[PDB]
Design a protein around this ligand. Structure first.
Ligand SMILES: [Mg+2]
Ligand SMILES: [Zn+2]
Lengths: 126, 158, 38, 237, 143, 64, 96, 176, 55
RNA sequence: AUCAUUUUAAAAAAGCGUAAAAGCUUAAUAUUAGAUAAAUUAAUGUUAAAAAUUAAUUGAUACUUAAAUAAUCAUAGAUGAA
């Protein structure tokens, strides 16, 4: 047909979720039924996803811990932050806004240090 | 880096891989050394006759790295050898004139299975049925023949 | 902009917006696709 | 396919059920194209009046109905719901199936003849039918449906059957009449095609041909071509 | 007019100041058809614009059909005379510049035999938008 | 005379019941699968007339 | 080099043999691999002679997953194709 | 149904209260400094997780304004003991600035003065081609950040001029 | 019939994107070695086996 | 020409894209969570079964055929709403 000539760039507004992570540790009870599968999917998005938008030292794992109270998603960020989120009651959507509540701040911490943690504009167009 | 920038299909002679300028149009802008490349190709294909044209793929990467992979020759070329013709029908289905017998199909399928990575899961009926549909598109049929053919070296673009 | 009584969508990206009695089309790719109804 | 090949090889023997089943349906249909199913259908409805005009009904989503009668019989015109009418189409058997209409204690047989729809608006205008009575002639449409035969030698290879007529118009004089016609064209050839009189000779006693509608018994339905290679060799040479 | 001697004789016909007729449509030859839905003066260019697009449908390369697809029955009926510019009234009737077809309400313009249902609906909508007339498409399926 | 019945006829319909109410079937079945190694199948319908208790194929083998 | 299939310089040419020498599944190739379409006509007549082997069912199903996608992609074409252009036809193409 | 989600930060601690009559339902947020309450109709049902500090809402009333109710509620709480942030850049030859105590001096090929003066913001320079703004309200920020943008913005032909650090940029060929 | 008779169940699942990372090392994933009891009966990623280690 | 295979599924492709290549998206599809599938009519009195029920409607959702109703826009002249 016709050739586009206006190039709309959307690389700088790209904000993936697992990008400021250094590690991860899935925890599973075989007695959960809602807290197992939620952690199944996260472990894929940590490895099935793309490595550009992750750190270089990102290592995700999975362990079956019968001793735990509930299946968990432990995580560790760059600048020191560390948390755990049990999964017998939650959703995959309630988790992501927590990750934004960290990832939105680490920018406010690292930009002040001078670090450009942003992407080129030419990475993804519309 | 390890991310895949591009994939290219090629066609090469086994032991006469050489920096032909008619392959630098594809591998030139990617910064790949044709000389250092063709070395690792000819090294592997020393157990293969040099007259034969193969094909290869190249997952060219973002850092202009490469990882070459080898596949069997073109399935059509192999049949033109047995059939002793160079050019096949314009039409297909309507114009059916060529003939092979099964006893070579059972032998050229092993070629694909022994080498090609895609068919490692596959059986031989599966592979043999793949080419018959490729034969329907070409003017070819599968009919019993007692005789053998005599040698022929049909062309390839290289 | 160009006033088309009969509006029309050229590319899939074109979409409609209504500001009161006002109607128009806009595109995120080709800013020449946009229109108004008058 | 849906299971890996490595497991299918272990269960390649299982697929006899696949092919042994398709024997059953396609043979059953192929021999049941001819016969009306023995199942009574009924349509509750209401009489006509001069009050119920079209557009009055058509907001109520009812429909008019019309019946044409036969020798000595009067016509009948009725009212009914649209969704009854489309459901009557939605059977296989719509071209010929006998449908009743219960107004009260009365029942009126019929057949489908056709329907008219308002094309620009695309709602149902009327549903027209044809009366059926047992002891008197009655117009019906017997479609022709040709079976495949791998028993003839010319039909198998490079020849083409040609069905010039889709059906036949007849007159039936009895309760149960055949849905359609089924043919086994083995004995046919290029030399003789089938002709309507070859059908007229083979029908029940209650059926006759409506000569008012057809042209001549010497008319022909199924025609067979010659070979293709015998043309193709001559075409090139 | 008079059909006896078309080319030889000079022809005149009364304009018909209010002429309306409806003719009950029904298919005879084939399966699907197009039919008009309004009294109208059907020109010739209303046909010749979308004449090729029917051939691309009904006829195709390297395919032979014994039976017939299209049945047309259109013929001209109205001369449509007119006066010059600076001419007073009276002193006779005007002269010719065109010919047309006066069609009734329910007129089978076309009758088709096993032609693609999906394209004729795409055609007749575009047909009717150029012409701005109401036209319909009918098939034995929907009926 | 048997045409209509054979159309809908299937022997595999019995499976979901026998899988429940036959311990003789499973306990030896456990041995076939877990411990030792063959191309076991399980309930395999013999031309839509029987269902063999345990079988191996293509060898046309039966363990009833 | 008087070689018919030999890619490997080391190997020799596998020589022909009687057809009985080979596995059975070559025999299922010489027969005309039907569509699922003609195969029903076979079942309409119950021709005991022509009937599919077991492996035929998988290939027939892969005609059928692939024919459904042929219609869905046609119906879009028939409805959205400019009248200037042409459709592919669904009938035979008698040449000459 | 769309089941909207209410985030709560970690610094905040909350409670949920009802009558014995059960005809009234309301909720109470409480921090070291502030405190804030808001009710829920009889037609809004609610779910809570301490695991995530998130609350879920259904609405039998089918009011579409709730999607705005969220963003106010969410940002009004994160507006306590946290900033919002933004970053600005430029690329060009005869361009510069100078910074003196939340009073930014802009020189982008214009005859007139171009002072920017911030009432109750924070502005801290990280490089010649980069500056961050910080403030607790997001809506004043953009009005504060965009005034800088309107002096020069991205040319659609070259990415020369100012821009935000996260934005949709347009480009068009020119002088091949 | 296999799913009921299994004892030492070992639920597995993929984290594959595409085989390009494996094809371009001339590798691939085998299933002839340990032709397992089950592959993708309901969950089209799950695999079940007896072997506590499965490479 | 429209075959065939591997796949849980994936068109000798319904389209954009290339000097030709490459690259992008739909159809078809999976994992996880949320989540629609609700109301009925007519038949052989009671004996088959480690087992199997026909013809048919209305309605919620998506695809699809499409039409109708209602409002809004569809530029206006020359002494001044007109
Ligand atoms: Mg393909
Ligand atoms: Zn647009």
């Amino acid at each position: 047909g016709k050739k586009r000539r206006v190039q709309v760039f959307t690389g700088s507004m790209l904000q993936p979720l697992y990008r400021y992570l250094l590690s991860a540790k899935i925890g599973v009870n075989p007695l959960d039924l809602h807290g197992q599968n939620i952690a199944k999917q996260i472990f894929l998005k940590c490895k099935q996803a793309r490595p550009k938008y992750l750190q270089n030292d990102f290592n995700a794992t999975l362990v079956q811990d019968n001793e735990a109270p509930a299946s968990y998603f432990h995580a560790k960020f760059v600048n020191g932050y560390e948390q755990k989120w049990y999964l017998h009651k939650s959703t995959e959507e309630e988790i992501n806004r927590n990750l934004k509540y960290f990832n939105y701040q680490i920018e406010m911490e690292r930009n002040l240090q001078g670090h450009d943690d942003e992407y080129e504009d030419e990475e993804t167009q519309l | 880096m390890a991310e895949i920038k591009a994939i290219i299909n090629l066609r090469l002679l086994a032991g006469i891989a050489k920096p032909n300028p008619k392959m630098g149009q594809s591998l030139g802008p990617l910064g790949i050394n044709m000389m250092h490349f063709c070395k690792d190709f000819n090294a592997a294909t020393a157990h293969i006759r040099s007259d034969i044209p193969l094909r290869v793929q190249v997952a060219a990467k973002v850092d202009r790295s490469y990882s070459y992979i080898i596949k069997p020759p073109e399935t059509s070329w192999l049949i033109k050898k047995v059939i002793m013709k160079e050019k096949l029908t314009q039409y297909a289905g309507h114009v059916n004139l060529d003939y092979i017998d099964v006893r070579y199909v059972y032998e050229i399928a092993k070629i694909k299975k022994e080498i090609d990575i895609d068919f490692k899961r596959a059986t031989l009926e599966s592979i043999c049925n793949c080419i018959i549909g490729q034969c329907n598109s070409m003017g070819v049929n599968v009919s019993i023949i007692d005789e053998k053919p005599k040698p022929f070296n049909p062309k390839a673009k290289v | 902009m160009k006033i088309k009584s009969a509006l029309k969508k050229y590319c899939q990206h074109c979409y409609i917006v209504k500001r009161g009695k006002k109607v128009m089309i806009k595109c995120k790719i080709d800013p020449r696709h946009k229109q108004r109804q008058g | 396919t849906i299971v890996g090949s490595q497991f299918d090889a272990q269960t390649e023997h299982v697929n006899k059920l696949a092919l042994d089943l398709a024997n059953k349906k396609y043979r059953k249909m192929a021999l049941d194209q001819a016969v009306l199913r023995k199942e009574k259908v009924v349509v509750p409805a209401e009489f006509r009046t001069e009050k119920d005009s079209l557009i009055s009904l058509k907001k109520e989503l009812r429909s008019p109905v019309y019946i044409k009668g036969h020798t000595g019989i009067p016509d009948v015109d009725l009212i009914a719901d649209n969704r009854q009418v489309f459901s009557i189409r939605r059977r296989l058997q719509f071209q010929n199936q006998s449908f009743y209409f219960k107004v009260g204690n009365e029942e009126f047989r019929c057949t489908y003849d056709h329907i008219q729809i308002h094309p620009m608006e695309k709602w149902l205008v009327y549903s027209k039918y044809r009366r059926y009575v047992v002891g008197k002639p009655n117009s019906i449409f017997l479609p022709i449906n040709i079976l495949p035969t791998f028993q003839n030698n010319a039909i198998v290879r490079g020849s083409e059957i040609v069905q010039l007529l889709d059906g036949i118009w007849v007159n039936s004089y009895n309760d149960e009449y055949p849905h359609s016609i089924v043919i086994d064209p083995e004995n046919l050839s290029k030399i003789r095609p089938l002709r309507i009189g070859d059908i007229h000779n083979f029908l029940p006693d209650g059926v006759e041909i409506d000569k008012t509608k057809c042209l001549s018994l010497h008319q022909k339905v199924i025609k067979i071509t010659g070979d293709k290679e015998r043309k193709l060799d001559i075409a090139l040479q | 007019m008079r059909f006896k001697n078309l080319s030889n004789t000079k022809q005149v016909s009364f304009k018909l100041r209010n002429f309306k007729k409806t003719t009950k449509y029904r298919l005879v030859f084939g399966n699907s058809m197009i039919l008009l839905y309004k009294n109208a003066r059907f020109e010739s260019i209303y046909f010749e614009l979308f004449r090729k697009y029917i051939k691309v449908i009904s006829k195709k390369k390297n395919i032979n059909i014994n039976y017939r697809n299209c049945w047309i029955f259109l013929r001209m009926n109205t001369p449509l005379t007119k006066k010059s510019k600076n001419s007073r009234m009276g002193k006779g009737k005007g002269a010719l510049y065109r010919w047309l077809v006066r069609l009734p309400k329910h007129y089978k313009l076309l009758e088709f035999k096993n032609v693609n249902y999906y394209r004729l609906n795409f055609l007749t909508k575009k047909w009717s938008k150029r012409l701005s007339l109401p036209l319909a498409f009918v098939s034995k399926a929907n009926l | 005379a048997c045409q209509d019945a054979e159309a809908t006829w299937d022997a595999s319909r019995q499976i979901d019941s026998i899988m429940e109410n036959n311990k003789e079937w499973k306990s030896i079945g456990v041995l076939l699968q877990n411990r030792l190694e063959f191309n076991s199948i399980g309930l395999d319908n013999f031309e839509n007339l029987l269902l063999i208790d345990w079988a191996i194929m293509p060898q046309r083998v039966a363990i009833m | 080099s008087e070689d018919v299939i030999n890619i490997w310089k080391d190997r020799t040419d596998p020589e022909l043999n009687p057809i009985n020498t080979y596995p059975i599944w070559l025999s299922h190739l010489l027969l005309p691999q039907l569509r699922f379409e003609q195969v029903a006509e076979v079942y309409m007549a119950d021709e005991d002679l022509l009937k599919p082997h077991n492996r035929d069912m998988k290939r027939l199903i892969n005609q059928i997953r692939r024919f459904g996608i042929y219609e869905q992609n046609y119906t879009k074409l028939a409805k959205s194709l400019s009248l200037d252009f042409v459709l592919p036809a669904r009938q035979e193409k008698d040449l000459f | 149904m769309k089941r909207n989600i209410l985030f709560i930060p970690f610094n905040i601690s909350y409670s949920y209260i009802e009558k014995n009559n059960n005809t009234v339902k309301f909720l109470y947020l409480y921090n070291n400094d502030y405190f804030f309450s808001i009710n829920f109709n009889e037609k809004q049902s609610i779910v809570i997780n301490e695991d995530t500090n998130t609350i879920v809402v259904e609405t039998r009333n089918f009011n579409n304004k709730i999607n705005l109710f969220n963003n106010e509620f969410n940002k009004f709480i994160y507006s306590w003991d946290n900033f919002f942030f933004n970053k600005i850049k430029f690329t060009g030859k005869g361009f510069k600035w100078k910074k003196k105590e939340t009073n930014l001096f802009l020189f982008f090929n214009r005859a007139h003065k171009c002072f920017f003066i911030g009432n109750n913001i924070i502005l801290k320079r990280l490089s010649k081609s980069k500056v961050i703004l910080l403030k607790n309200n997001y809506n004043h920020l953009i009005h504060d950040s965009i005034l800088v943008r309107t002096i020069r913005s991205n040319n659609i032909f070259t990415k020369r001029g100012l821009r935000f650090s996260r934005q949709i940029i347009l480009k068009k060929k020119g002088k091949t | 019939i296999k799913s009921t008779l299994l004892i030492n169940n070992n639920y597995y699942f993929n984290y594959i994107t595409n085989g390009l990372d494996l094809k371009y090392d001339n590798t691939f994933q085998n299933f002839e070695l340990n032709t397992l009891s089950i592959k993708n009966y309901k969950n089209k990623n799950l695999i079940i086996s007896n072997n506590n280690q499965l490479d």
